[PDB]
Write a protein that binds this DNA or RNA. Structure first.
Length: 50
RNA sequence: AGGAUCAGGAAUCGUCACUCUUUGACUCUUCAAAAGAGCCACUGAAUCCAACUUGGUUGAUGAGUCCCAUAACCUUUGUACCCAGUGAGAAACCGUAUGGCGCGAUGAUCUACCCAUGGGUGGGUACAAAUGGCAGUCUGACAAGU
């Protein structure tokens, strides 16, 4: 997921002539990566009985 | 007089924990099945497809980092050795009545084959090194919740 978003982030940094130089797209990526992480730890592989 | 049945020799503790081993129970469980106190109903849970939802090729899932590609094992090219050690043997006079580096243990002396003690070939052992071998640059479509 990071190695995905790294390609979205690095090419935002290595290939943009106009650039804020301010880390937004990387943070827009990292918010979703953290959200995938927070959805991922939400799941549990155990048995949750009622 | 020596031995074995019914004085020459340690063993009188009102337990606390801890660890270890041991067997037994135990929920199970493979060998591997087979038998089922049987049927209804109520109610609960779980699973699986369909469904729907949310996320996703701006990459969902699957995945032996670490057993080190940071390598192992070689392979070729430049050096250090040995079938460091050997250790007593190497060369034949003397400034103006008298004075010494004239060796040497405190070290003199050397560093499997052919060629008259000049040169090297052959094998083991070690390393440096490889844009050398061995040795050929991941997937990609569902996933997850009810």
């Amino acid at each position: 997921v990071l190695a995905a978003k790294a390609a979205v982030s690095l090419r935002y940094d290595a290939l943009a002539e106009d650039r804020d130089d301010s880390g937004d797209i990387g943070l827009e990526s990292r918010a979703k990566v953290e959200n995938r992480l927070s959805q991922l730890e939400g799941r549990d592989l155990r048995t949750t009985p009622k």
